[PDB]
Structures are given as structure tokens and as C-alpha cells.
RNA sequence: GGUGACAGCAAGGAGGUCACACCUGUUCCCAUCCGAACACAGAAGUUAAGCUCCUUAGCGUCGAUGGUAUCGAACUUAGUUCCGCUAGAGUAGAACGUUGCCAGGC
RNA sequence: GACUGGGGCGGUCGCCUCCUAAAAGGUAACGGAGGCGCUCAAAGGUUCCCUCAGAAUGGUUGGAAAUCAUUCAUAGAGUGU
RNA sequence: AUGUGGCGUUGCCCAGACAACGUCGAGUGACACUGCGCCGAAAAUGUACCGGGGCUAAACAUAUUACCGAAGCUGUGGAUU
RNA sequence: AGGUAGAGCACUGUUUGGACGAGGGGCCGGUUACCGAAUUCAGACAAACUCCGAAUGCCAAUUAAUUUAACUUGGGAGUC
């Protein structure tokens, strides 16, 4: 249910989603997260249903650092109406996530423990997945 | 924090001598006091070269009676060297003070001359 | 400490270079005091191998052509996608 | 069936460089169309009050630099 | 210092600059020739349509 | 000191009636609730401050080398190859002004 | 009367500014946003001068703050629409 | 998903590590960036996509060469400009 | 001449976690945590944010090479 206090226009353009993950890639305020390989428009509803899926996992002992946020709004059309009456209205909210975006960020857990919590909410969530640690070398 | 008047000067002057200058055929003088002396140093700014100047502490007219008479005779003398070359149309660059006084009396005197402002 | 690194040999495209970076090789450069530009490909099992036990901050005696330079790490590109470092660049202080 | 609330616009204006830098120009020639002063006047150039810089003789055109960041044309006469 | 310039391809389905740039070099049909003097102004006419001739050094 | 061509901000250090400022003023032309401003009349004492001499790069300003892409061309309908032009970050490094024409005094 | 993703109903019809517009200019849709159909004998001319909202500082009633001085205070002030 | 494919390190190491309640001998078991597979995938006249026959190469690849292939170009003769 | 791609948050707006005490407040005026705004170290995003910016395309000038067009004024159209 996360989405702007306020914004600024309403009926905004469709964003991209040819290229790489243009920063926030790696994971710096957590100890193990997981991150996008193909491109999506993750929208409210499904990071809700993967952060409930693993807050009703972990049993609130650890916790879920959200590294995206639904900036976009978009919008539809009355059911299947004629074209050609200027834009509809808002529908929803969106953040794009290109290959390399750390989508869900986990801390203070065992490292088995996150290793399944983090595989289901990939069933979730339209973008396939990858497990991470934080970095060495 | 008591501020400094040459710094607002020095403002002025960059402020007010953004249309004013020197061609060689019209010369412009310019004119500064501080406390105690007057200076005034003619300058034509194509070449940015010194032609003529004129000093309350140079030796020939050093007299201490009143601070009028030195702006009367320093003028008055500046006139000398202009009527050798360049006496005639000249600008007056009033440097960043009013038109009151000392000023006043220097313009009087490199006036009624034998120059052209 | 002796790390064996071989020059780039003059104008390496991005095509030549992308292709040697694919057999495991990987660009490099020094800098610094003493010493000018210079284009160098290092190998990398054997840097990973030397920075796991050296401390990001530390000492290297890698040996750059037909003298040997003590330098240490500075700087990485490192793309995350299928883990291989990019660039690695050294300064020679002296 | 419907109500749009848009469909405004205004002519558009042809503002911008009008000479090329290098060109020969004539008396009196517009040099470059502008509402403010993107561009400031130079030598022998003015400006009209539409913001319009033109020149005041015959000559060669030049963009050049007038601060650190403020620019200028200027004209100068010998061909 | 001499160059041997012909062209092997068509123009059809090219640009108007491509068709442009093959003639000024003075080529005008497929596989037709020309013998021009070596000079940087011609070579940059080479390289703009570099897919549609070949160039011989005589 | 004056004018005149392309580096700053501050922070400890000092040094002098040749500079110019700090001051003495309401006395006069000037001049505003206030000579706090602006004027003009002093010139007693004076580098404490401004000025002024490296300066600290700490803040700031420039700026490499590596090289991380988008015209052209094929392959193909999923972004892969060969080209040419190379950024923004960012590293090293520089950097506490080069200094144009006169007075005075050298 | 016309326009119109058939027509009707509905909305609109002139001018100004910005995105779309692909670093010259131009560029469409019943694409996305706002304005106008005036005002001012000074809010015009010309000679001078003159230069912060906010904060912090304190200050006789303090609607906390308006009125009062000091440290700022990049112009964030401000400019009739 | 234990379908298989390397480069890999590795915990336990033939002092006898996984089993059978001491026999037992050759590696054990783990953790991944990648290759081909895996199911994945369920309409109506008649086989039905090599177009057909057929093919384990006559498939897909790479590296050389040969040849065939247009009213393109070259030979030969002609016309009109 | 110029602000697109890309990038970047210094300005306008969005942002998530992590932050600091004066104070309305706990009370029997106060403690203190706690409610709210402010500044604060900490980091992602934009068609109507930018200062840091391409490749191309544009205008022009030329003792810089190959090429054969270009313009003005008239007769005749078709096309929407």
C-alpha cells in the first residue's frame, strides 16, 4: 500500500526498460538481499505479497529492507470503450527494475534461513531471481 | 562589522564606467581623493596608456593654506600639458564620488581652461 | 607477492580487448611516482588469490615488464552480472 | 460522447541563431532571435526591444565569450 | 598514389547521401570504374561508402 | 600608490606616520531619529584592525592516463558483432595567481 | 454549421506559455498542463543614491512571529498579470 | 526436479570418512557463475509443413576451397537520341 | 550556434532506512519517553529537475579534391 503523499502530475509516460540497472545495485544496509536478471515493472501489489510472504516467514525475528519504491503512476481505460477521448485515470504504481537492481534486502538472519525465505517471494514477484551475499574480494 | 569606502568605490567605478571610455579623440580624465591629496590620471583605454597626470603632492605646488586651491591649481595645471596635445573633446569619469565640492572646483579649474568639457 | 603481468601491446579496440577478457585475462594500469603510462593485462585467479589474505590495503610486488614496482590497490570497476573483475588500476608511489 | 479539457497551444516563434558565425553580414542585420538575453550584445551589435541583437555595420560576425559563462556577439568591420 | 575504385553493389535501397557521396567519386553504374589521384578528400568519400566499392592500388 | 591583460574563501605568523587606513571632531560647503551614514575641517598618536609578506591546500579551483557507450555496417526480432567519435563519475596530479602602461621611490 | 476512431448526445472553435519535439528551425492526435479578451499619469522617462525571505540572537502587551537591534542570510528576496 | 556438461575449491581423508546391525576400501560430499535437455503446452472436412519424396546427415555448426544461379555486368550485330 | 542520449543529484518535487536536543508533554512547576515540525549523518528516482554533456544532424567561410548542377523570370499542368 505504498505510494506517494502527493505527485506532482498525474498522467505521466510510460518509463523504460531497455538497459542495465542504472545504480542501486549492490547491498549496503543489510547482510543478504536478492536482485533482478531480467527487466519488469514490479508494481505495488506484488511487493506487497512478497514482503508479506516473508514477514509471515521469519515470524518478525529479522527484517526486510524495501530498495524500491512505486514513483510511477499509470493508468487503463473503462472496459473496452471506444478510442479516442483523452487519457483515463490512475490505476496504479510502478517501479522498473533492469538486470542488477537489488530488488529485497534481509539482515540478521541465518544465511539457510534467508536462502528459502528469499526463494518465495520469487514465485511472487514477476522477475526472475538471484541469491547474494554481501561482498568480498 | 564597519565596512570600508574604497572597496564601494572601486564598486562605483566598475558599475557606472561600463559605458564611459576613451577613444583618442575624446580622452577621458578621471579624479581620486582619499584623506589628504588629490590624483587624476588621463588614460585612453583602446591602448590602456598613460598620456598626462596631475598631483596635490608633487613638489611644485606644495602649499597647505586650503584644500581648495591645490584642486584649483592642480587643474589649472593639468590644463598646461593639455594644451600642448589633446585639448579637445574630453570626458570627466567622476571615479565613484558625487559632483560636491573638491570635485566641483577641480572641474571649474581644468574648465574654464582651454578644454572641451 | 610476485605477481606475473604481461603489457598491452599498442590499441587494443574494444572488440580485441572484450575477447581477451574472456579467456580470463583482466586490463590494468600504474601510475604515480617514477614511473609514466603504461597498458597492462594482469592474470586473475592469481590476484584474487593474492587479495584474500593481503588486505584490500596492502602491498604488491607485481613485476611489470623488466623491473619491479611496490604498489597497491586503488581502484576496481567490478560488474556485477556474472561475477569477473573489469579493470584494476595500481599507482606507483615509490 | 466525451469532454477534453486540453487542446491549447500557442505559434510557435522562430527564436534562435539567424547568421553563422564567419559570415559577412550587412548593416542593420538580425543576428539571433531570443526572448531575454541568452546572448548579450557585443561590438557594434545592439539590441532591440523584442530582446533582438543586430548589428550596426557592415562586417564579419564572431560568437565569442563574455565572462565565465555570460556570451556575446560581436561584429568587426574589415571584411 | 593511385587508386582503382569499383562499384560491386547497387544503389537501390540505399540513402540519398550514399547515392550522393558514389557520385561525386564519378562511379556510375555497377561494375564501372574510375582512376583518381590519392588525396585525403578522396578517401573520405571512400570511407563514407565503404560497403559499396572495392579500391585497387595501381 | 594609479589605471589597466588573462587566480578564491578563511586560517596561525609577523613586520611601519614614505603609502593608505584607524582615529580628533560639529566648527564651516555637505548632512540624515542619530556627523550611526554622507560632508568638510583637523593631523595629535598609530600597523591593534583594513591594507599589507610567504603562507596552511584544511575548504575551494582546475585536471590527466586507463576506458565504462552512440553514427555507419552486417546478423537478426533479440539483443548479439565489426567499426569510428568518446562521456559523468571517478582515481593520480597540479594548485594559496601570469602578470599589460605610468607617479613616487629604487 | 462544422469537427468527430460510424452518427447522435457531449465537448470544443480566436490569441499567449510549457512538454510531447528525436541538442538549429518546423512538426500530429477528442495527447498532457495553465493563462487572455487587461492594467499603470505612474508600475513611464532621466539624474542620483540604495540592497534579503527565512533562521539564530535577544526585546515594555509579545495571537509564537508584525513593531525593536546583532550574526548571518546568495539572492532562496523580488519583480502588477 | 538426483537429467546431465566442465573449470572449482573443498569438509570429512585409505589412522579406514557415507551404509549393515567390527565386516567394507577409493574418494568422499558439498557448495556455482555456464551446455545441451526436462516436463513444461490442452479443437472441430483429410495426412498436413522438407512444399513433396525422403534423410542420423541430405540436421546444426566452424574453416577452406569448387560449381550453379537475374532481363545485373561483359562478348557480337543493330536502332533512335 | 545548441541542452537530446547518457550521467548526476547542487535547484524544484518523490524517497527508504538510519538520526539529534530546546520545547508543548510524564507528574505530583518539572523528570521522560513520547506527538509534531526543524536542522541534521546517512542513499535511490523524473516528459514538463539539471551543470558537469555526446555521437550525429545545422549554418557558414574558404589559393583546402572529385563531381554537374543551381538560380531568376514566363507558358502548361496534375496532385490534396
Same mark, same amino acid.
Not at chain 1, 524495501?66 to 512505486?70: A, G, T, V, Y
Not at chain 3, 556485477?80 to 573489469?86: A, E, F, G, R
Given at each position: 500500500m505504498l505510494l506517494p503523499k502527493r505527485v506532482k502530475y498525474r498522467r505521466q509516460h510510460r518509463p523504460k526498460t531497455t538497459?542495465?540497472? $542504472? &545504480? &542501486?545495485?549492490?547491498?549496503? /544496509? &543489510?547482510?543478504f538481499g536478492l536482485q533482478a536478471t531480467t527487466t519488469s515493472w514490479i508494481t505495488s501489489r506484488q511487493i506487497e505479497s512478497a514482503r508479506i510472504a516473508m514477514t509471515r516467514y521469519m515470524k518478525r525475528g529479522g527484517k526486510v529492507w =524495501? $530498495? =524500491? /519504491?512505486?514513483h510511477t503512476p499509470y493508468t487503463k481505460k473503462p472496459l473496452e470503450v471506444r478510442m479516442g477521448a483523452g487519457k483515463g485515470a490512475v490505476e496504479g504504481w510502478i517501479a522498473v527494475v533492469k538486470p542488477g537492481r537489488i530488488l529485497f534486502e534481509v539482515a540478521g538472519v541465518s544465511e539457510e534461513v534467508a536462502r528459502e525465505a528469499l526463494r518465495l517471494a520469487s514465485h511472487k514477484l514477476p522477475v526472475k531471481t538471484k541469491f547474494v551475499k554481501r561482498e568480498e574480494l | 562589522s564597519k565596512i570600508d569606502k574604497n572597496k564601494v568605490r572601486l564598486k562605483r567605478h566598475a558599475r557606472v564606467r561600463t559605458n564611459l571610455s576613451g577613444t583618442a579623440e575624446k580622452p577621458r580624465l578621471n579624479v581620486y581623493r582619499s584623506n589628504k591629496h588629490i590624483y587624476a590620471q588621463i588614460i585612453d583605454?583602446?591602448?590602456g596608456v598613460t598620456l598626462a597626470q596631475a598631483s596635490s603632492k608633487d613638489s611644485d605646488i606644495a602649499t597647505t593654506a586650503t584644500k581648495v586651491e591645490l584642486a584649483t591649481k592642480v587643474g589649472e595645471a593639468i590644463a598646461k600639458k593639455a594644451a600642448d596635445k589633446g585639448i579637445k573633446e574630453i570626458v570627466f569619469d567622476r571615479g565613484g564620488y558625487l559632483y560636491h565640492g573638491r570635485v566641483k572646483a577641480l572641474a571649474e579649474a581644468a574648465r574654464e581652461s582651454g578644454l572641451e568639457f | 607477492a610476485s605477481l606475473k603481468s604481461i603489457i598491452r601491446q599498442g590499441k587494443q579496440t574494444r572488440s580485441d580487448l572484450k575477447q581477451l577478457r574472456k579467456s580470463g585475462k583482466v586490463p590494468a594500469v600504474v601510475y604515480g611516482y617514477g614511473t609514466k603510462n603504461v597498458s597492462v593485462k594482469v592474470d586473475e585467479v592469481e590476484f584474487i588469490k593474492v587479495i584474500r589474505e593481503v588486505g584490500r590495503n596492502g602491498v604488491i610486488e607485481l613485476g611489470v615488464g623488466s623491473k619491479t614496482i611496490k604498489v597497491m590497490v586503488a581502484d576496481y570497476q567490478f560488474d556485477?552480472?556474472?561475477?569477473?573483475?573489469?579493470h584494476i588500476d595500481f599507482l606507483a608511489i615509490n | 460522447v466525451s469532454s477534453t479539457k486540453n487542446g491549447r497551444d500557442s505559434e510557435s516563434k522562430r527564436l534562435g541563431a539567424k547568421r553563422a558565425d564567419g559570415q559577412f553580414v550587412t548593416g542593420g542585420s538580425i543576428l539571433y532571435r531570443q526572448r531575454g538575453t541568452k546572448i548579450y550584445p557585443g561590438e557594434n551589435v545592439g539590441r532591440g526591444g523584442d530582446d533582438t541583437l543586430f548589428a550596426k555595420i557592415d562586417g564579419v560576425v564572431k560568437f565569442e565569450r563574455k565572462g565565465r559563462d555570460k556570451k556575446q556577439v560581436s561584429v568587426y568591420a574589415v571584411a | 598514389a593511385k587508386l582503382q575504385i569499383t562499384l560491386t553493389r547497387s544503389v537501390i535501397g540505399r540513402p540519398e547521401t550514399q547515392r550522393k557521396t558514389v557520385e561525386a567519386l564519378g562511379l556510375k553504374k555497377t561494375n564501372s570504374s574510375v582512376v583518381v589521384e590519392d588525396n585525403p578528400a578522396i578517401r573520405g568519400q571512400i570511407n563514407k561508402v565503404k560497403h559499396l566499392v572495392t579500391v585497387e592500388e595501381k
Open positions: 538497459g542495465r540497472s $542504472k &545504480g &542501486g545495485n549492490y547491498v549496503t /544496509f &543489510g547482510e =524495501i $530498495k =524500491i /519504491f512505486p | 583605454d583602446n591602448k | 556485477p552480472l556474472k561475477n569477473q573483475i573489469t | - | -
